[PDB]
């Protein structure tokens, strides 16, 4: 009975819930037609699967996900592929025009005109369940409808529901390689809504995910369908508390009273361990006391920061299959001893741990091996500020020559939120600087 | 879903017209008679933004071909692909345009311009989403360039929030065909800078460097050289029609590389281009595609890019392969040419990619860029309209039919005002 | 599905 | 064979019968592969 | 060509290689591809995941069975692959009495289970 | 993995590098249609070194043909493994040099030099490791080497830290075809001593005398010339495309045999050279090869090793064999003839050795040699240029080309004072 | 409990260490895929390949091996050869160019490319080690990669691992026989490394394992395919006492100790014995009383000197097998009765023993004879004055007038370094004299 609602919104989260909602019908054993045939254990289990997948009397599971796109093309290729079956036909909803990569179409013009339907199926998905922990929200900060459509949606949905937490997944801009180019205003833009309207967001970029594939996987060219199944899996063990049984676990309201220490400083990272092709498992052991070492190195890092230069402020670590708590333990032993990896002064306890008695699923035809075990590291630290410093970097000298201010304005914006923008993260940086500093 | 209004006027637009439903009818695979004949059912989900359905599954384009002589209807409706327009649609008159300006924007082309706007809104509202606007002219004609601009003037009076798709064949210098070609060139682009969103230029002389060298044709004559602009021409709708994994539309390419409101006449390309030669020895990969991209070769204007600064690139791709390849030479070529870029545009390139390539062929790419080597080709027509000016030659041909000389002169004014922004901003 | 020609 | 002569000529097209020979072998080309191309698709 | 100009030196036709024992290996020449046609035309929509240059298809020894005719040979034409070649055939049995072990981690150090404050209760049988 | 460019300038040069294409072709059973037709694996894992791999299997060199004369390219595609090269490489103008070194740096190939370095820029760029060039060329013509020597410039200041391998062969006193050959050889000698990493020199006379008393061969045509040539060109890189019991690649063989830097020009070798009828009456051992590595008769060029001293010396062999055995014969060598070798460096021999031979032999050698026996030809071809040059011979057709004469004083003294760097240390 | 860490620069250094790991794999009765066959706990001795090898969880034995060299074209013949499956994929390190016979080019310019990668496995392969005794590290002093890469890969491992030994193996110029001609250079470069951050570097030539084939093996063509398997026999007798239990047993510091007497004189001398072949061993009896009397023949040792110019210092012989322990005793008694072998006054004792009960075991195809006993001797003499003086003379010839110099001051190493390093052989010729003479 502990449910929890996904929001998929922009280009970007409707291509990952395609490789995301692949895994989560593969770890129960749920066909994508939506049925359940004799891999069921009975007299239990009932409510591992009534986190996702709400049952329909008739046998059918219909998930708990909405599909937010103005753009039709993306949902037409889910309406008529693998699975049309399997989502309900009303959790799809499409628009008639893209945001065509602005922030002002995504959110005034044409935003308007259809979050009523999206708003109203989010409150007949709400009802239905029993006991609803938070909100699971997969979008890009550098889009048009992720930019745009997430902003007002964040702005409404914490009208309707108060103080219920917000978990978010996003797609920040790499340092080098960027797809768009209106992507320094469209991710200013966009972090004047999280700062006060959204709990805990939670950021990677493409640059650090496709060079993670190339020597540790040793696939040399990745792909957006090899990106998304590696995001997924994370997800999936984040949620892994609420689904089944361990020694001790960690849920919604758990890890954000772990990881938020301050109203505003609430951006953490996130590792995922070991990622290995199906050649180096038999060769190299899967110990605890290794798997936990590969997080904290900066080379298995999905976000393009040197952690290094930074300071560790909380951490949380979420080990599924075979975990004996000894072993983590002593493993943890071994990272406080490390001078390489430092804390602040006011936070002498900073490790959380919760273990799962659920080894890992692998995809057919993936690219991942089966590994026995799992580990799932989610760092808050203050060497995110340097990511944020580059792309701050990017405005001020693109906001001097006023360039591609007019497609702004001419929607209905007006000039004065480029300048409100700009200084949010003047005190942002501020805000990490006067926290890191010791006392 | 989305629907584009195709308009055709003046000779050279109206092969090129022919040639456009040339290629697209067989990437569709649809038949002279109307019929689809195909083998995939991805080309049908997106058929209604190019053609419209009618009586017994027959397709006709929804395009409008208006020229003020009969005689560039003969060839079009007895082509290859000629039964397959509207009859409704050919509009036409009876006069010659002459190669003047004021026949086809002042004295002709004012009676047959209410007949023109008629089928228009036949067609415009017959769309469900109407999305924008393609046009194909010449500026060196008469009721190509006098007709052209005079159908931009009248239709952006009645949808403001569109966006215009024009395609202009420019001036050539050494291959000048007409005599008042710089006098129809002035008068068109003074009002196409002011009332439209993107101009696509193209110009003879380019062609024939790309059909000479790249291709080696021995004959290059119009139906090969309409045909190489045809691929481009398909190529800047490729998302609107097809899955991909990044789709870009024309509104967001329209955000992407239009800094500010003048500075948005741009140039076309078409990626994977060889010769019968060496067939066998080139690679179709996208490290090699990418370098083909960014030769100055491979332009269709006659205007070099090293003389000039690249502001905003987009490359819209098609075909299957890994993105990250896409994503790092379109990264190493921002890097290993900053001096080509600008300073204060971080990420000068826009990606975007399909999942269709087209028939007979791998891979596909489509190259749209922004320069400030435009230049080259704005000053050259404005050195030509001061030499003939102070001597007023030809001149009769236009005051004798109702305009005042000094209209001359904001036309000459905007030119070297519309340059003074690009150099200004360099 | 099949061929013909002429 | 109809590539084997068109690539064993010479590098030269400035003779008006060398033109004629080289359009007419690409000619060729082009409706051979139209034939096969025509045969292989229906199968 | 001119007959002074040809010499019978070196004379290379395009090289159907002779029966096996000619050759200086034990193999005949591939067959390769019959139709250049289909060579030149039929090329892949399809690219492989782990090779970054499609130019170079055979990036990192791939699909490559040199040690395959190596063992197929009865000696190698690589001085390198002398070592392994006759472990399949041994000559003396191995020795296997004088090895270390560790008995004091064998039979000290237990995992789990706490079996003194338990009763012995089911399956116990006295020594 | 590891990768050479290849260049070919000049008719002689030509011929003889289309001989080479031939050679490694059938080393790795490539045919002239261009699939793999071979038995081995080996021949497989690097067979990138030198070619190009297209798509669908078919391999191409990794060359660029060039010269001024296009009648040479029409026998080269007409030749027998002609099929294989890139049209897109070929070269070619319409004014021949004439056999005039100032036609060939300064008049015709100042205009030509922009063409030949985008298609050497094109091979390099697509690289993964590149180690450096390999460039066939004459000393003897104003072809080869005028624009040879040209080459090697232009790309030395480019590309600061590579390997240039360039194969000269040399003009000879008896055997001159041409009448201002040594005025051809002293301006291309000045840029090889500065801006080259090793020179192979080759003499048309000592092929003669190889062909005529060694090989007893009744016909030595030119056809068989460059097939001696190109055994000892193949037999350089087997440790780049073959794996042996003793790898060394270039830059090891050019730190080996060059102490100082104006001193880098190799005389090379072939091993297994012997007639038709005494192939049954000899034994093929490695103390035999030794024997005939030696022979001032097996030499490629008409400098007599004894009338000199020997710097460095290297033996690079190929096939199985013990190798204690290669290095007491490359040490008891030293010890029964001291007096040729220097006496301030010991250990003058280089061992190399690969484990697969070419194909139809036992088992190979290469001989390379760096000795003191070459100042006898640069005093031959300095003496002859001095009695022409006094008399004011020849010079009509260089200084109405724009050649003064400072810079043929100037190319004496730079030979003259190499002539003095080889008999310092003897 | 007792590991020992591989690693292999060079060709000369890993086409050895191909031999290495085919005599260790047959001692054990391992596979070359790296499966035990039917020895699963069962006589297995779980123990007995701990020293070099690691099991895995499935059963499969990776090895403690870190090939890495700048060439393809030496490490790509076991990722072809029968040894691709043995070896963890991470370990086998590949270059792309040469350093290709200079000094600078392995120490300054090619190898800082590489190095990050090679510590970055020697961290990870000690983490799984329990107790770490020392490095089996194999090189030539002649080359430009034997000498340039491990001169300062020794410097890294002497600021980060101090308490641990480092058992080096070099191939030494021989004075008749050599290939390449830089060669006095190279080691002139390489003895800096060894008198300050090597503790036991063994010293071995080409040309006296070419007579002892000669004579002993009565081979008539010797091959480098025979002079490794000669050499890792050596090896797999030093390290004997861990595998195997004995009646005295001498783990990595006991040996060090009582070998080195000052700090700067740690270059010993190896010998193994008997060498026979299969044909003489009929006619010839074996006893411990005279195989020891073989190993101070003037014609048995491996390096080219004659140790009767000069006086010992240390002994130790490593018997193996079925040798009595008494025997060992009225042999040492032999040897100190022979008025040619002559000691050091300040020494009263000499030699240091060692016998173990597991018999050599020969590879398949391979010449050496079957034993039931063979002895190994480490000698530390005063012969090898000569055999620097030499080489001393080789470099003094060619650097008077500045020969080969314009390369190596080409990469950037200034020409100081060739007075420097020469004067520091001239002080290692000195501190023999000035501990040779009596009291
Ligand atoms: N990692 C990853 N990024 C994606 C994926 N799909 C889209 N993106 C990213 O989304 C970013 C910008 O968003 P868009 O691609 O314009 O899509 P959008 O958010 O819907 O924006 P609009 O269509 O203009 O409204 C790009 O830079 C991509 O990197 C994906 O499947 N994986
Ligand atoms: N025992 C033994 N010695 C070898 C072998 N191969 C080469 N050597 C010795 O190694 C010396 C030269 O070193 P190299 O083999 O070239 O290896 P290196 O020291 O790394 O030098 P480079 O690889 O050229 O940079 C030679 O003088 C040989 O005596 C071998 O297979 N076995
Ligand atoms: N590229 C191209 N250009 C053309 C074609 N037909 C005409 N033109 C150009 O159009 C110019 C003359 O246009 P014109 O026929 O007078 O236009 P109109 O009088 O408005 O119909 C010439 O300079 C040509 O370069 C064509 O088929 N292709
Ligand atoms: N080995 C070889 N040498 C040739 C051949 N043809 C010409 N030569 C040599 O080239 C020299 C003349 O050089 P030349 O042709 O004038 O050089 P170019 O100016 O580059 O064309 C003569 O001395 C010939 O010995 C050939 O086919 N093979
Ligand atoms: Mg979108
Ligand atoms: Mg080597």
Not at chain 1, 90 to 113: C, F, M, P, S, W
Request: charged share 25%; aromatic share 10%.
């Amino acid at each position: 009975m502990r449910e929890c609602i996904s929001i998929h919104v922009g280009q970007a989260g409707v291509q990952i819930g395609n490789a995301c909602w692949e895994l989560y019908c593969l770890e129960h054993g749920i066909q994508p037609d939506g049925q359940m045939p004799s891999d069921k254990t009975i007299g239990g289990g009932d409510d591992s699967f009534n986190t996702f997948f709400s049952e329909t009397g008739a046998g059918k599971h219909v998930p708990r996900a909405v599909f937010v796109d103005l753009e039709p093309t993306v949902i037409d290729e889910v309406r008529t592929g693998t699975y049309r079956q399997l989502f309900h036909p009303e959790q799809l909803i499409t628009g008639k025009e893209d945001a065509a990569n602005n922030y002002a179409r995504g959110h005034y013009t044409i935003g308007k005109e259809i979050i009523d339907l999206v708003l109203d199926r989010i409150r007949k998905l709400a009802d239905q369940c029993t006991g609803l922990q938070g909100f699971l929200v997969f979008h890009s900060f550098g889009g048009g409808t992720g930019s745009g459509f997430t902003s007002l949606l964040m702005e409404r949905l914490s009208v309707d529901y108060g103080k219920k937490s917000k978990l978010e997944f996003s797609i920040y801009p790499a340092p080098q390689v960027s797809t768009a180019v209106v992507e320094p205003y469209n991710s200013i833009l966009t972090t004047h809504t999280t700062l006060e309207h959204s709990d805990c967001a939670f950021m990677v970029d493409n640059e650090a995910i496709y060079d993670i594939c190339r020597r540790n996987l040793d696939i040399e060219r990745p792909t957006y369908t090899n990106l998304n199944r590696l995001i997924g899996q994370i997800v999936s063990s984040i949620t892994a508390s609420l689904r089944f049984d361990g020694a001790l676990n960690v849920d919604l309201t758990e890890f954000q009273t772990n990881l938020v220490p301050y109203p505003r400083i609430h951006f953490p990272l996130a590792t995922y361990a070991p990622v290995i092709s199906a050649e180096k498992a038999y060769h190299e052991q899967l110990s605890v006391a290794e798997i936990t070492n590969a997080c904290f190195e900066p080379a298995n890092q999905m976000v393009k920061c040197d952690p290094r230069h930074g300071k560790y402020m909380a951490c949380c670590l979420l080990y599924r299959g075979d975990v004996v708590p000894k072993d983590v333990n002593a493993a943890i032993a071994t990272i406080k001893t490390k001078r390489t990896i430092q804390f602040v002064d006011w936070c002498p306890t900073g490790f959380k741990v919760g273990i799962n008695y659920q080894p890992p699923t692998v995809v057919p035809g993936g690219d991942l091996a089966k590994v026995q075990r799992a580990v799932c590291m989610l760092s808050n630290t203050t060497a995110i500020a340097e990511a944020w410093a580059r792309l701050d970097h990017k405005f001020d000298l693109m906001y001097a020559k006023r360039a591609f201010v007019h497609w702004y304005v001419g929607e209905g914006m007006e000039e004065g939120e480029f300048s409100e923008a700009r200084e949010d993260m003047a005190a942002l940086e501020k805000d990490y600087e006067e926290v890191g500093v010791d006392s | 879903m989305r629907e584009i209004v195709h308009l055709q006027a003046g000779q050279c637009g109206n092969q090129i017209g022919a040639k456009f439903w040339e290629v697209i009818s067989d990437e569709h695979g649809i038949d002279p008679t109307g019929t689809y004949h195909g083998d995939s059912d991805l080309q049908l989900e997106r058929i209604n933004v190019y053609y419209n359905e009618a009586t017994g599954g027959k397709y006709v384009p929804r395009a409008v071909l208006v020229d003020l002589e009969p005689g560039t209807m003969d060839s079009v409706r007895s082509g290859p692909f000629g039964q397959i327009f509207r009859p409704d649609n050919f509009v036409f008159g009876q006069s010659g345009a002459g190669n003047n300006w004021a026949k086809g924007h002042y004295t002709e082309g004012a009676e047959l311009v209410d007949s023109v706007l008629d089928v228009v809104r036949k067609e415009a509202e017959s769309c469900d989403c109407l999305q924008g606007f393609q046009l194909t002219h010449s500026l060196g004609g008469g009721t190509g360039s006098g007709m052209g601009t005079l159908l931009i003037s009248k239709i952006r009076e009645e949808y403001p929030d569109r966006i215009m798709n024009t395609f202009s064949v420019v001036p050539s210098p050494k291959v000048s065909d007409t005599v008042v070609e710089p006098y129809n060139a002035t008068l068109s682009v003074h009002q196409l800078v002011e009332n439209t969103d993107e101009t696509y230029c193209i110009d003879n002389e380019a062609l024939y460097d790309i059909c000479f060298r790249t291709l080696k044709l021995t004959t290059p004559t119009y139906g090969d050289l309409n045909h190489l602009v045809s691929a481009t021409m398909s190529g800047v709708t490729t998302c609107l029609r097809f899955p991909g994994q990044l789709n870009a539309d024309l509104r967001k390419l329209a955000v992407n590389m239009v800094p500010f409101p003048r500075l948005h006449f741009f140039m076309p390309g078409f990626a994977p281009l060889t010769s019968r030669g060496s067939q066998q020895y080139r690679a179709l990969t996208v490290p090699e595609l990418t370098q083909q991209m960014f030769d100055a070769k491979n332009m269709m204007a006659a205007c070099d890019p090293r003389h000039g600064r690249y502001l905003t690139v987009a490359a819209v791709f098609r075909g299957r392969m890994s993105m990250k390849e896409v994503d790092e030479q379109m990264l190493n070529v921002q890097n290993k040419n900053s001096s080509y870029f600008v300073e204060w545009i971080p990420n000068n390139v826009k990606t975007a990619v399909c999942d269709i390539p087209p028939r007979g062929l791998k891979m596909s790419a489509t190259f749209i860029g922004n320069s400030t080597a435009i230049q080259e080709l704005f000053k050259r027509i404005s050195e030509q309209f001061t030499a003939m000016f102070r001597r007023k030659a030809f001149l009769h041909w236009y005051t004798g039919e109702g305009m005042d000389e000094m209209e001359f002169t904001e036309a000459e004014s905007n030119m070297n005002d519309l340059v003074s922004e690009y150099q200004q901003y360099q | 599905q099949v061929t013909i020609i002429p | 064979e109809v590539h084997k002569e068109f690539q064993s000529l010479s590098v030269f097209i400035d003779s008006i019968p060398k033109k004629i020979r080289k359009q007419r072998l690409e000619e060729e080309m082009k409706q051979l592969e139209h034939d096969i191309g025509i045969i292989e698709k229906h199968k | 060509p001119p007959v002074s100009a040809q010499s019978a030196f070196s004379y290379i036709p395009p090289r159907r290689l002779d029966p096996k024992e000619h050759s200086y290996y034990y193999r005949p020449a591939r067959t390769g591809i019959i139709s250049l046609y289909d060579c030149i035309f039929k090329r892949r929509l399809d690219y492989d995941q782990k090779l970054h240059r499609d130019d170079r298809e055979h990036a990192k020894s791939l699909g490559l069975h040199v040690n395959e005719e190596e063992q197929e040979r009865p000696v190698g034409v690589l001085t390198s692959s002398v070592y392994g070649k006759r472990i399949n055939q041994p000559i003396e049995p191995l020795n296997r009495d004088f090895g270390r072990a560790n008995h004091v981690q064998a039979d000290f150090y237990r995992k789990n289970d706490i079996p003194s404050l338990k009763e012995p209760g089911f399956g116990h049988i006295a020594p």
